[PDB]
Symmetry: C3
Subunit: 146 residues, 3 copies
């Protein structure tokens, strides 16, 4: 089986991110969750690693171009989730850009399910700042940490 | 009749904002125009109150979560205007988020009419910064103030 | 023939920008490439002028409202390129706004071709920051300069 990179800021990690990973796992020998910089990066990477206990998942900080990171980690797939039509336009453009940058890497999309489509990082982060309960939307460990 | 909250930054208040309020009034006992922070908040709230003379309208500063503000002010409806397809995606996601946060509150949309669809706050604000006449797009009081 | 203004930040100038200009030239006596501020403006204007050698092209810095700039330079057309559905919504709103600001000016669109649709300024700029090769996407002069 191939290896996939699942990049994001994960600021915070949501139930939606976890769902995408769990749903994609049967296709890949390994999924590497690559955390890009924007609370601290290392804190976020630790937090993700504690939530994602499946042995096929590795969490690392994303440095450099994603396609270079993918090459380095022997990954020929980029995993992305799609929540809405507004996502699709940007991801479609990024997939194309990354294809031109490195045609050996393929981008695949899983649709956000059910009650994950509205749950976005910037949305959840807005809630946290205003003092709202965000625990329905994130893993328990993340809620505790927030 | 129920009570609605009409939230926004209103920076500046446009003819389009006023139009949405006037058109929604027949459905509500009261509309509370909730001004979120981003010229000063208190100046903006004063300016809106001077423009919106209908006794069913109250202008207040928005603190905290919108659904909490709505609860506090006995409002079970959130009024939003929709100008374009790009609006809809974000408002649809926010309506869902607010439903999960507080299922007792309902979100309703009125479409922007006619020659209000292109008139957006960030658009009008760009014009002001560059020294353009923005008086066709805002209430006279707001034009004077700008 | 009429005169068109082709405004943008051109930060950096891409092959896609050049393509739009070349494709539009047969319709206009002159195209004025108007560079808005956001590496330095004057450096960017110089760089564009060196790339665009066709005598019907003039490069200048954009000051003030675009419709005022257009009037000053005897231009009754604004040239814009469209890459994606996400572009269209914003350009449609801006065209309308500029029509109300100055109904004598017309906005026209050319679709991005082929392998230019994904190549956007903020995309290319993200690549440069991370140390990627951006030379497939920009004119040689621009690549050298970056």
């Amino acid at each position: 089986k191939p290896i996939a990179i699942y990049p994001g800021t994960f600021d915070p990690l949501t139930n939606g991110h976890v769902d995408i990973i769990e749903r994609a796992l049967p296709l890949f020998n390994k999924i590497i969750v690559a955390c890009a910089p924007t609370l601290k990066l290392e804190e976020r990477v630790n937090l993700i690693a504690d939530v994602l206990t499946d042995e096929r998942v590795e969490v690392l900080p994303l440095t450099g171009l994603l396609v270079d990171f993918a090459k380095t980690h022997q990954a020929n797939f980029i995993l992305r989730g799609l929540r809405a039509v507004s996502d699709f336009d940007y991801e479609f453009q990024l997939a194309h850009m990354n294809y031109q940058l490195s045609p050996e890497i393929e981008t695949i999309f899983l649709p956000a399910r059910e009650g994950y489509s509205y749950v976005s990082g910037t949305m959840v982060r807005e809630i946290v700042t205003l003092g709202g309960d965000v625990s329905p939307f994130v893993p328990p460990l993340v809620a505790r940490h927030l």
